[PDB]
Amino acid sequence: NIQGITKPAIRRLARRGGVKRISGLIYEETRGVLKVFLENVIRDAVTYTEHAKRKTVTAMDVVYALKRQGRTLYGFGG
Amino acid sequence: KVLRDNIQGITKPAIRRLARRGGVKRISGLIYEETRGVLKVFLENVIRDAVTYTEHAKRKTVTAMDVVYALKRQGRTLYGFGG
Amino acid sequence: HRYRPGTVALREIRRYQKSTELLIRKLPFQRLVREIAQDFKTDLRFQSSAVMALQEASEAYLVALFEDTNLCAIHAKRVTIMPKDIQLARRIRG
Amino acid sequence: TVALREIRRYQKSTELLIRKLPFQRLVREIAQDFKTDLRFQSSAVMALQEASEAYLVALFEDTNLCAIHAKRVTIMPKDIQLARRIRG
Amino acid sequence: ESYVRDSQLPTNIRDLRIHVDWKSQTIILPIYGRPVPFHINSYKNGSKNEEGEYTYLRLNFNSPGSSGGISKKVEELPYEESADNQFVRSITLRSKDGDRMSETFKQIADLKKEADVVQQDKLIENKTGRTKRLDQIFVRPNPDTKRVPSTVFIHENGIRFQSPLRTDSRIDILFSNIKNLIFQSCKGELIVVIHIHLKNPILMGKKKIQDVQFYREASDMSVDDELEQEQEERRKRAALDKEFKYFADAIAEASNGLLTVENTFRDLGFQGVPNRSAVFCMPTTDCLVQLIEPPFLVINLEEVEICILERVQFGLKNFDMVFVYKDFNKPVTHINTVPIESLDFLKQWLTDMDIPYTVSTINLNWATIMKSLQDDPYQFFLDGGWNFLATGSDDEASDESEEE
Amino acid sequence: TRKESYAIYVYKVLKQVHPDTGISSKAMSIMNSFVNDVFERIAGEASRLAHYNKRSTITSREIQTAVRLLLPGELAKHAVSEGTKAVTKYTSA
Amino acid sequence: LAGNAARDNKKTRIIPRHLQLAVRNDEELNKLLGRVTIAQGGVLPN
């Protein structure tokens, strides 16, 4: 599951960041960080849906959740 | 009238005591002027917002309420002054 | 010719900085997100655009965090990033 | 060794390290640029000073952490800009 | 001594430039047209200044107020032969007139630096019927940076670590020099280990070491659900554990109950930081040790007077504690990150040891107290003993009122 | 002049949670600004939620989800339990 | 929590040092009020 975010992909992310050489523990630790941040966003998203009385995680609700977190996203919602 | 070196009024011992409250053990000499500058930039940000609130208020005094409100815009809210 | 170490990595740095594409694969990431969301409300469905939003938000977060990680390493006088760098970056971020 | 104490004494205290009147004059100096004839509240001046105090304290915490990563027990200015930029 | 006779002249008879000698570990200077040699061990330091065109060189010897921080103290070279006798402290020169002075000043800079063991009794080796031998044992600190596997043996008047598996070199340890032998097992630990702490450190390999240890590793992580691996690991741990316990009994009968081995109190242990690293403390019968990861430090409890807990406040999952010794010449150690839940265990342990403790929040130097108490052991009892840490009048704080 | 203060009720809460304890005026101002800040946070979250779901009226449901969002985990659980108990007693009366 | 800190300090009254000490030390309420600064709070031992 979180292991699906694999070493080549973590390397691609780090190269977008700028990193030239990468240590091996980077992959596992980054996987953990991704797990944590995804939990933080999804909790707000699903809570928004339970208020909305919908059974699906709407992208508008996602944008509102990311707005609450402060890591605002533009384009995939009104 | 005119004031100068008021940012220099921040003293080297004051910076060192701040860094020690913050946990610093050994302090390089160059730290002091740059901390003075960081404090300076933060103060124009806060004071600009506070004075803007007052100019909206049609008031010649910068109330602690307006100060708190400026800090709240900056995202560094403080409790204890006004309300 | 046998490329010396690091040159191809620098090439990829330029390449993926130029690109504007998703660097984590869509179905693995969708599976991951669904696995997280099992806990909060089970059997929950996802709008696909919503999944895309989670994905690019995560991409931005990890990209900025790797930037901070690399800055930490260069501060540490070490070109290779270490986990130490990631903890330092997140601890400064707070 | 007194340096090592000198961390731990001021950590308890609630005192405002920056002296009161030079901060008042600094604050009015910055005020003059944006508007003059501004008669600040004393409460407003203390409110500014406390926030500045806390901000610098957090900055020095992050600075020392950067140094510990570097294997340097001395804070260098590179630590200051590194902390500022990572904080954003 | 610099020289001994007239036959050995300086490098040049007409020494119109200030000369520095290397062979005889001394240098000559003319104080206004007539010579004198002085010694590197008689020297402290040198310094420079350039001003306009004029230049001022300062050279400081080793003397009272210069070599020692406080006068009238006890030092090897100046004081020991004569404590109340004339010496010289520092001189200066100005040699702007010739461009040969920076060269000799840098030769000074390296000559000051250019220039150590108590020898134990030789440990007699005897191959008797009762012979102790176990393999895959690694010694630490090692003779060289690489890791040395070999065997260990017990004899009647010391401990012998035979290298011939690796390099045939011989290292000897004297029974009287060993102060404390302690075992620590693999119960929650990554190694299985035997520590011997020595009172007279020995020179071995490349350096001078006090603490000596021999262990075997218990690592399980690999970078190359099956129950066979778990069974193999459990068999290895248990079988080698019975081997170690048998070996401990063997050395116990060899020592005839003199050099006792203390049992780790894992219940009493805690995650401390005495060596600025996350280590799990594990108190023992008479010598508290933290013997899991390096750097490795041992504190002898026989020479501990009392203990003082500092950083006493709620919300402090890390709080510090001080060993007040009976001998203050040695440095003071600071265990850090003591868990809150472990405070009761520390108190019970100290009560068992019968050592009165103090709990407080105030801070003063350790340096000035050590200096003053070496100056007079009783001055601090005169000025009130360890009760001074207790606060009687710090400040007064209150408020007008709060009502509406 | 009348001053809008939660202090009168905060003092009662302080004595019930801890009878013998007292409060400085400075700490009392900390609490007054605290209650104002938390009230504004929750009320603003409720207003945004009413707009987001297009509801024209804030209700207990909006407030409890706002609590769920703004508070972190453990305080969120205990706060929602205490609050649902509170509206329950109010309605049952 | 503030009264509990005050009882450790032995002072009957609660002061903003106690208020900030409780907030910083308790993880949960530290997440609620992390961005906040408590006036004259001070910093925790470390």
Chain E residue with CA closest to F2: the answer is E404
DSSP SS3 for E286: coil
Identify the H or E element spanning C5. Answer: none
Nearest to D79 by CA among B41, C82, B37, B34: B34
Cis peptide before E295 (omega within 30 of 0): yes
**Paired tokens of D16:** 């405002």
**Which residue in F14, F23, F28, F42 has the most chain G C-beta atoms within 10 A of its own C-beta, making it the best mutation to test that interface?**
F23
**Which residue in E402, E403, E404 has the most chain F C-beta atoms within 10 A of its own C-beta, making it the best mutation to test that interface?**
E402
Contact D47, B77 (CB under 8 A): no
Helix axes C48-75, A7-17, angle to 10 degrees: 70
**Paired tokens of B15:** 């910076």
The CA-atom distances, in angstroms, between F61 and each of A51, A53, F66 are 8, 11, 9
Distance CA G4, CA F29 (A): 19
Contact check, Cβ <8 Å, B79/F26: no
Amino acid identity, residue C81? Answer: I
Question: Domains in chain B and their CATH numbers?
Answer: 1-83 (1.10.20.10)
Identify the H or E element spanning A76. Answer: none
Q: Please, which residues bridge with residue E152 across strands?
A: E134, E161
Contact E279, E293 (CB under 8 A): yes
With a CB cutoff of 8 Å and minimum separation 6, the contacts of E143 are E163, E169, E171, E204, E205, E206
CATH fourth-level superfamily of C1-94: Histone, subunit A (1.10.20.10)
Alpha helix locations (H) across E256-287?
A: none
Q: Is the dihedral of CA E206, E208, E214, E216 positive or negative?
A: negative
Phi, psi of C90 (to 5 degrees): -70, -35
The CA-atom distances, in angstroms, between C37 and each of A45, A65, F65 are 10, 14, 18
Nearest to F49 by CA among E348, A6, A61: A61
Q: Is the dihedral of CA B28, B31, B33, B36 positive or negative?
A: negative
Cis peptide before E141 (omega within 30 of 0): yes
Nearest to B35 by CA among B21, B50, B52: B21
Phi, psi of A26 (to 5 degrees): -55, -40
Contact D48, B70 (CB under 8 A): no
Experimental method: cryo-EM
Query: Cβ of E117: how many Cβ atoms within 10 Å?
Result: 10
Q: Name the residue ranges covered by the structural domains of chain F.
A: 1-92
Whether residue E311 lies within 8 A of chain G, CB to CB, comes out as yes
Distance CA E186, CA E333 (A): 27
Contact check, Cβ <8 Å, F29/B77: no
Locate tokens 């919602």: which residue? A77
Resolution in A: 3.2
Chain B residue with CA closest to G46: the answer is B23
> Which residues does chain D break after (C to N > 2.5 Å)?
none
Contact D59, D83 (CB under 8 A): yes
| Structural class in CATH, domain F1-92 | mainly alpha
Distance CA F51, CA F57 (A): 9
DSSP SS3 for D41: coil
Query: Cβ of E271: how many Cβ atoms within 10 Å?
Result: 14
DSSP SS3 for G33: coil
DSSP SS3 for E284: coil
The CA-atom distances, in angstroms, between C69 and each of A22, D84, E135, E186 are 10, 14, 44, 36
Contact G23, G44 (CB under 8 A): no
DSSP SS3 for B58: coil
Chain F residue with CA closest to G17: the answer is F27
